[PDB]
Each structure stands twice: as structure tokens, then as C-alpha cells.
Amino acid sequence: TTALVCDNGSGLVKAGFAGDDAPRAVFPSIVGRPRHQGVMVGMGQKDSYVGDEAQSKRGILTLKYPIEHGIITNWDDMEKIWHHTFYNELRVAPEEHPTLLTEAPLNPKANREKMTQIMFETFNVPAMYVAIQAVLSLYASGRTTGIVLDSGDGVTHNVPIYEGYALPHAIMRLDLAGRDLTDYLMKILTERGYSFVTTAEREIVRDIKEKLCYVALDFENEMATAASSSSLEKSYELPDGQVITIGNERFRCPETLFQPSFIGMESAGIHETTYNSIMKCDIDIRKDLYANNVMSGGTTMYPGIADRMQKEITALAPSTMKIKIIAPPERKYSVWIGGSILASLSTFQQMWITKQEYDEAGPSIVHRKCF
Amino acid sequence: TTALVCDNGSGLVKAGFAGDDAPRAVFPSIVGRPRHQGVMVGMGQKDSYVGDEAQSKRGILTLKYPIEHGIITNWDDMEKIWHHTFYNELRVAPEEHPTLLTEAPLNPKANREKMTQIMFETFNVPAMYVAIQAVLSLYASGRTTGIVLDSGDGVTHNVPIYEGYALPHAIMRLDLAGRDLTDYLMKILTERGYSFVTTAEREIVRDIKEKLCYVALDFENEMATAASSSSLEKSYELPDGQVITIGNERFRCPETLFQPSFIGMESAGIHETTYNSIMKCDIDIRKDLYANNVMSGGTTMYPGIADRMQKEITALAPSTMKIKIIAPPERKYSVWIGGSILASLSTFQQMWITKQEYDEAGPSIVHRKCF
Amino acid sequence: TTALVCDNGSGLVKAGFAGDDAPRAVFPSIVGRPRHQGVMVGMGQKDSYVGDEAQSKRGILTLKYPIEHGIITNWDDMEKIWHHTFYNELRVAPEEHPTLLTEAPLNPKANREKMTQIMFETFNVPAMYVAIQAVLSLYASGRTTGIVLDSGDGVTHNVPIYEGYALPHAIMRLDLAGRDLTDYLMKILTERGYSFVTTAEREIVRDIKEKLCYVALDFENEMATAASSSSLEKSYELPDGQVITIGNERFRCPETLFQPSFIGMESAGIHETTYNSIMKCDIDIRKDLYANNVMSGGTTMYPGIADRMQKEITALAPSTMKIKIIAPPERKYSVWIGGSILASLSTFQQMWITKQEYDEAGPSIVHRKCF
Ligand SMILES: Nc1ncnc2c1ncn2[C@@H]1O[C@H](COP(=O)(O)OP(=O)(O)O)[C@@H](O)[C@H]1O
Ligand SMILES: Nc1ncnc2c1ncn2[C@@H]1O[C@H](COP(=O)(O)OP(=O)(O)O)[C@@H](O)[C@H]1O
Ligand SMILES: Nc1ncnc2c1ncn2[C@@H]1O[C@H](COP(=O)(O)OP(=O)(O)O)[C@@H](O)[C@H]1O
Ligand SMILES: [Mg+2]
Ligand SMILES: [Mg+2]
Ligand SMILES: [Mg+2]
């Protein structure tokens, strides 16, 4: 039988079969419940929608995300989402397929206890595994060395690897990702009057960000240019025809990644975090880590991120080092692709947590056979 | 047992069984009593005449409408009208048929509380249920969603719906309707010397309104044409052979709907009262409401109201929208058609307020089950 | 030279000299224009009215507010109001008096830009300044650490301040204030048959809300008691001598502040707003914020509001964190008293935007020299 691969992204769930080059079913990780008094019988049924059928009817819905900063926060909702991904998107029976979930580094352990318990007692998958997304991303690049800078909707994290041996002490994590950038955009937009207040309008500001934002190579130069000319402004059309116009908001939002003092945080930017992660690693290996700066996750899709990161890290690291930021075109799906590759491997068969293992050991077993 | 459907409009009573596509009994809502002395015996009796009879003797009667601005004020007269409807018109005892009574939004709760009291304690129906009119209007059109404009004899209200879910905070009620247009037409005919005063002559200026009134496309240019030549004049034959002629009084009267400042009121004309109702909805669904604008009720029957409405809204809403005024050909009875459809459903049986529930709950029960 | 402190409210304008502990002039911020036709010669002149002379005549006027949600919607009218305050009320030649004005947080930049432009060019004041309203609201209390809850007629907004250092990420601004409660009260009044629809009647409903509305502590049980008997009902004599009797509408109105769903808004109540604001401030200062909540603005003068908000915040914070709400009885004018104090301080004399500085810098200086 062929195992599945279900990447529980913070924002979007990725799913697909083991061996597929690309995921087969992608849909935002939302649960919607209406917030108005229904009037028509035979109509407005299905108290709760999931994924696509909650986006396409969000006008009257309260969209709750069940995954917050990479940590599942509302279990009965994630159960519905898994049930959907299994029985409606892929159209598969879970009991007859192994599966490969994922997790971010340094998440509370009870999180993965509960993931495993749901998978084994509710859906009765024969065997399942829980990887760490950065390792999978480094698989996907077809590589053996690097410092995966992964960042998606919830979290931004680094994971240095050298010739197959992880360096757990050098891992750095940071809760500043796509959702926080969106929430800061909602706020900088009110300088022009555009008030977005509802959970549904978060999904409009998200796409405004996705389509219009970019990261300036140099922030102060871009601020000056925007202030002294209109060459940057770009106009966007709401769902209801209103045409909004944004200028320096196109780069003031992505720039949050590098100066988290914009959104009130104290910690340092992603470039400084990566440098401080490399400098935790033994002297003999930093030379290769500087030369394999892999990237992953959606939030690294902004134009100008790769060049900005290369410039900044070159500013940090010594003059003699050969920095290289690697940005695969499919980096949004790198984690899932690597997961498929790992699941298809010939030597991975023994590594599963068999149903018998859970029977004889409980959910705590998942800490001995996982990274 | 078959279920009855009644629609106690402010202008006419529409009543008849479910499953039919047209009301069985249609007649005006007036009870007339003599204002003169009856000298002859046997003939000249029955101090109260109702419905069509009252009109046929409107010479020697004072005609009272028990309903004014959708509110039932004279309860004795209204009970008379219902007694006529049940026994003389439909010929079927109310003691053995569930009933559905239409009603208007933002009405005093005492209104429907007393409707329930009267139906259960005076006529002893097995079960009754009260429904809004815009909801049923939408039912008739076979739609899932759309902004309904309903404008009968007394009350004009908008109820934007979405996928079977309404928006109570987006309702508007504008108590300016056919009766007020009749009064203003009566007031502006005197510019020619046709002094209509009596109520019986209100029943005739209303006939003039129903026959000749039409809504122009541009008021200023129509006035220009009217001043230019006699092309717009048309004549009408009173009951005693006199022939009248009216020019710009034909469209100056429906103009009220678009400029209630004509009759002193301040609230904005139906174009603005519909635009402002859409512009209070979730920003997501406005594009949907624009393209599914429904109409209903008699007052929307003026030749050309749909085009003026479309013009005004398209001049208000963003240029990218694709407006559509859904005007059913039978829109006069649309409320009752929708009521028949709703009463005929198999899964609507969960909504009837049974005699048992009223007896052990009191009239206040009607609010727990009625929108 | 004496300075002027002009707190432009959305419903009232509190303006006067700095140093006093009360404004020298208060008048509603409405510009009325006659709407009927004048017939008597020697009358009908002065075809645009302002303030209280636009109350006592409101019978024959359409009342329009310049500010809708702390935003200056109209400028041709706000110029009239400012001219009125400077010349007719205070009788002061503005060309020789520094003026200090106010604004809310997250308020569009063009708003204060154009305020500066008008004051420096239309009136030609030697110097001026604009201050957020939570800063002044906290000055008036004499503290230096606390999270203000300003609740005006148009806007409700918190500001966490610690030792004089604001927390710009934790400023929660909610556009739901006294005016929206006025409109909700008008909407629910009809349930009893009372129908107020026009601008003038909106003032009557404002006074009804002021006099009779109050906040309950347990809304569900308050409704239970109100339904049980008429113990809570009180009467009000409209200006023509009519008498209305409002019952549960007394506290169903200001309950909206703690359940913004009633009017369709999604955000959580103001207690939840304040608590969510607090839990985003670094952990060590939450203790000092939980004990220094300062109320302000007119809409906070509901009876029982302080008890309700204290109870509800206790329901959200942990058990051992002291929770207090400081509510000065004079709080309606807290913003203006803070403005007076700030203008009086000896060290503030350098913080003005001088006419010279504007002349050589342009409006953008407003965002530079002012917070
Ligand atoms: N082309 C893009 N440009 C900028 N941001 C993007 C782009 N595509 C996705 N994002 C952002 O990245 C996040 C989704 O990336 P993804 O890696 O799928 O997150 P997750 O793995 O948590 O589901 C979203 O917050 C989205 O706003
Ligand atoms: N063909 C028509 N043209 C213009 N006005 C009409 C026409 N028919 C009815 N009306 C007006 O609409 C009112 C009756 O229509 P209706 O929709 O049935 O109101 P209701 O249902 O409350 O009784 C009358 O007052 C009349 O003035
Ligand atoms: N006792 C009261 N109860 C409730 N609301 C009140 C009371 N007094 C005044 N208000 C409301 O406060 C508002 C005006 O007060 P104010 O603080 O000055 O608002 P603004 O900042 O715009 O000037 C009005 O909307 C009024 O309805
Ligand atoms: Mg990911
Ligand atoms: Mg009608
Ligand atoms: Mg204020």
C-alpha cells in the first residue's frame, strides 16, 4: 500500500499521495460557522463548513483557524479538517494507508501526543510518523547540507544540518510569520482610511499583501523614493469594486520580517537569527552552512527577499565567506515534496510507529522514533 | 389536511390554499358603514358591508381601512375581514386547517401577538405561523440570495438575504407606499380643479393611479416635454360620465418614491434606501446583492420603475458592478406564491405553532419560532 | 499669550482657554440648513445654522454632522464650526492665540494634515499642536500609568501607557460608540409602536438615551426580571406632550457595547477589547495596567457600566490580579482638562508647530513634531 502525506500547515493544509511530485489537495485550514439568524428552510444548513466551502461563503461566516503559530489550539476543529482531507478531498479510507504528518521544532510535546492519538484511535491508520518540517525541506532540495530557513503562516525557524547530523542546540525559532505580517498590514492600511475589521476581511488583506507586497533591497532608499514620487503606487480592486491605492505599504509590511520592532517585538530579524544560528555551530562546519542557505515556506516568496537576505548576511558574515541564498521555485511545497521523498525511501519502512507499538506503549512512544 | 395561506396586505387581502399559484380570493381591505338614514324596510339593512360589496356601495358608505402603515389598528374591523375571508370567500372552516399569516418587518410585537390570539381563540385553527413578506417574495422567485424590495399599499421595506441567512441590522423600513402616493395625487389633481375629497373618491383617485400612473426615466426632461406640448396628456372617465385630463400629474406622483420631500418626508428615495442597505452588508456579498436585486408588491408595478431603479443604483454603486432588477411578471402576488410554496413543504412541519404550544405558552410564544 | 484648547468631539465641541478646569463653551457639532420654503419677507436669512441655534430650530432643518467616526467627513462644515467657536462663542481673535486640538488613534493622516493646513492658512494662528486623546484623558487623572478607555459619540479606543511610554502595537480602536447606540435604540423602539425616523427626532432619542438608559450587571437575568413585571419601566414626555414608556429598551441599548453582535459588528465587547489589549503588553507591566484602568468620554457615563466592566474583566484576568476601574465623575470633559493641563505645562512651549516651521516644512511636519 502507498502512504499519504498530510502537511498540517498553519494556514493551508497540503495533502497528497506518497510518490506524487506535487500535493493533490490544497485548501486553507479554516472552519466557518455562520453569524446571522437563518430564515430559509431547506437552506443555510451544514452548521459548519471547512476549507474551500468556508472561503466561498465567508460573507456570512466567522472563520476560525485551528492552528496558531504552528501549535494546534482547538482539537475538535482539527479533527474535522483531517476528516475532510481524508474523506472528501483525497477520497481515501484512512485505515488502509500509512501517513506522514509534520510538526515544527520546539512545539509542546502534548501536541504530537494528541496528533498521534487522533490518528491511531479515531482514523485507525496502520502506522504514522511525525517529522520536523525543516528536515523534510532539506530532503526536497535533494541536498545533504544546509541551514533550512523555513517560514510559513505561523512560524519562522532555522535548522542547521551537516552531512546528515542535526545540530539541535543551534536551532532558532521565531513566532513572526505570514499571519502577523497580515495583521500589521491591516493596521498600516488605516493611514489611508481602509478599515478592515472582520475575520472575513483578513482574507482580503491577505490577498492584497500576497499580490502587491514586495521587500525593498534597501528600506530607507525605498522610503525616500516613495515619499518623493508616485512610481511605486499600485491599485487593487476589492470584491465590491472599490479601488484602493497603496504606496510605501508595499514594502513597510514585508520589512517587518527584518525589524520586528515595527510590530512591537524585541527579537532580531530573520537574517540576524540565521547568522546567530550559524555562529552557534562548530567552527569546522560554518563554511558549508554559509554556502547552502536553503529557504522554504510561503513567506519567503516575496520579491526581493533572496537578494535582501544575501546582502544582509554578507554584511554580517566575514568578507571571505561565499554566501549563497537558495530559493527553489516550488519552495511553498518543499516541505510536502520532501515528505513524499522521505516516505518513498527504501530504508524508511522500519521507522514507522506501528499500531502495535501504540497499543503496547501509548502515545508517548512517538518521542523515541522521531526527531 | 390542507394548510391555508393568508396575506393581510395593507391594500388588499390575498388569501387561499397552499399548492395553488394564485390566491383564491382577492378583494380590497375595507369595511363600510352607512353615513345616511335608511328609510325603506327589509331593504336598507346590514349596517356593515365588507370587501367588494363595500366598494359596490361606496356611494352611501364611509370606507375605513383597518390597516394603516402595515399596522392593524381597528381590531374589530380586522376580525370582520378575517371572518369574511374564512367563511364567505374560502367557504372552509378555520377549525380544521393550519394557517400561515404574512407580516411586515419591524412591526410592534403586539401586532403578531394579537394575530395569534385571534386565530387561536376566535377561530381555533390547529396551528398558525407568521412569516415576513420579503422572505416569501424571495421564496417565490426561486432564489438562494438577493436584496428584496417590497412596497405594497402601506409599507416599503428592504430585507437583504444571503444563502438563506438574513441581515437584521441591514433592514430598512420606509413607510411610504401606494396609499401616500394616492393622497399626493389627490392633492395635485386640484391644480386642475378636480376636487376629490370623500373617501369614496379616494377609491377613485387610486383607480386613476392604478390606470394612468407611470414612472418617467428622467424627471427634468419629462417635465420639459410636458411643458412643451400635450403629448403626455391622457383622460379618464369618472363614474358619472365626467372626463378628466392629467399631464405631468401622471409622473409627478410616482416621483414621490424617489423624492419623498414632495410629501414632506426626509428619508431618501428607494434608490438610496436600497443602496444604503446593500452598503451595510459584509463587504464580501455586496457584489452578489447588486446582481440579484428583487422587486415585489403592487407599488412596483408602475411601467418603468425597474429601469429608473437600475439607472439610479448604477449611478450610485461602483462602476464595475453588474446591476439587475429582478422584476417578476406576477410580482403583485409574489408574496402569496412564496407563502404557498413555504406552507407546502414537508420539512416546514417543524415550524407550525400548534394549539398546544400556544395554550401552554401564551401569545409570547410566537417570537420564539418566528423571524 | 493665552492658548485655546479645542476638543472637537463627534457630538459636542468643548472649546476654551487653557488653564481653566472647565471649557468656556460647549455646543453640539451639527450644521443645520433650512429645508422648507420661506414666505415672510424679513425672514429666512442666515441660510446655514450652527450649534444650539441649530437645535432649537431643528423642526425646519436637516441636521448633518461634520465628523462621522472621529473622521472629518466634511470640511466646508467644519470650517463653519471652527469659525463659530472662535468668533461667536469665545469672542477671541484666533490670529494671536496658540491653539491645541485633538484626534483619536489610528486616524487617517490626511485628517490631521488638513486640520493643520486650515488652521495655519484659513485662520492664520501663530502656532498649534494636535494630541491623541488617551494621553490627555490620562493627564486629567494625574496618573502616568494606565490603560484609558475613551468612549465618545463616534469612536471607542484604548491606549496602554506605562510610565509615559506608550505601546503602539496595543492600541485597540473600535468604531462603535454612543451614536451607534442612539441608532440601535431608535431601531428597537418600534417594537412598542414608537417610530422616530428623522434627523430632528434623533436628538430626542439622544436625550431619551441620556436620561433613561442604564447598564445592567447580568443581562440575561435583567431581561428575565423586566419580562416578569413592569418594575423597571419609566416614562418620557416628548416635546409635543406625548408620553412614551420604555422598559427593557432601557438596558438593551447599552448592552450592545458588551455584545457588538446585536448590530452585526463582529468584534468582541469593550471589556474583551480592553483585556485583549492588555494581554498583548509585555508580561511584567500587566500588573500595573490591571490596576489603572481610567475611563473617559461621554458614553462611559452610563450608570452601572463600571461595575459591569470590572466584573467582566475579572472574568478574563487571572484570580490574583487586582482589577480596578477609575471613573472620575467629571469624566465627560477629561479630554479637555488634559488638554488644558498639557498646554499649561512649562516644558511644552517647545513642542508647538510654529507658523514658521510649517511655512518652511509643509503639512508633513504634523506627523514629525506630534505623536
Ligand atoms: N506569493 C506569495 N507572496 C507573499 N506571501 C505569500 C505568497 N504565497 C503565500 N504567502 C504567505 O505565506 C503563508 C502561506 O505559506 P505556507 O508555507 O503555505 O504556510 P503554511 O505552511 O503555514 O500553510 C500565508 O500567510 C501567505 O500570506
Ligand atoms: N398596476 C398598478 N399600478 C400602480 N399601482 C398599483 C397597481 N396595482 C396596485 N397598485 C397599488 O399597489 C397597492 C396594492 O398592491 P399590493 O401589492 O397588493 O399591496 P398589498 O399587498 O399590501 O395589499 C394599491 O394601493 C395600489 O395603489
Ligand atoms: N448619562 C449618559 N448616558 C449615556 N450616554 C450619555 C450620557 N451623557 C452623554 N452621553 C452620550 O455621550 C455622547 C457625547 O459625549 P462626549 O464624550 O462628549 O462625545 P464626544 O467625544 O464626541 O464629544 C453623546 O452621544 C451622548 O449620547
Ligand atoms: Mg510549512
Ligand atoms: Mg406589501
Ligand atoms: Mg473624546
Numbering used by the authors:
A (entry chain E), B (entry chain C), C (entry chain D): 5 to 375
From the paper:
ATP-hydrolysis-coupled actin polymerization is a fundamental mechanism of cellular force generation. Actin polymerization powers fundamental cellular processes, including cell migration, organelle dynamics and endocytosis. After incorporation into F-actin, subunits rapidly hydrolyse bound ATP in seconds.
Reasoning that continuous conformational flexibility was limiting the resolution of the 16-protomer reconstruction, we focused on the central 7 subunits. To examine the internal deformations of individual subunits, we superimposed each protomer with a subunit from its nucleotide-state-matched helically symmetric model and examined subdomain-averaged Cα displacements. This revealed complex displacement patterns that were dependent on a protomer’s strand membership and lattice position, primarily characterized by subunit shearing around the nucleotide cleft. Consistently, solvent-accessible volume measurements also revealed expanded nucleotide clefts in the bent ADP–F-actin protomers relative to bent ADP-Pi–F-actin and straight ADP–F-actin controls. These were broadly consistent with actin’s nucleotide cleft functioning as a deformable locus that coordinates mechanical rearrangements, the rigidity of which is dependent on phosphate occupancy.
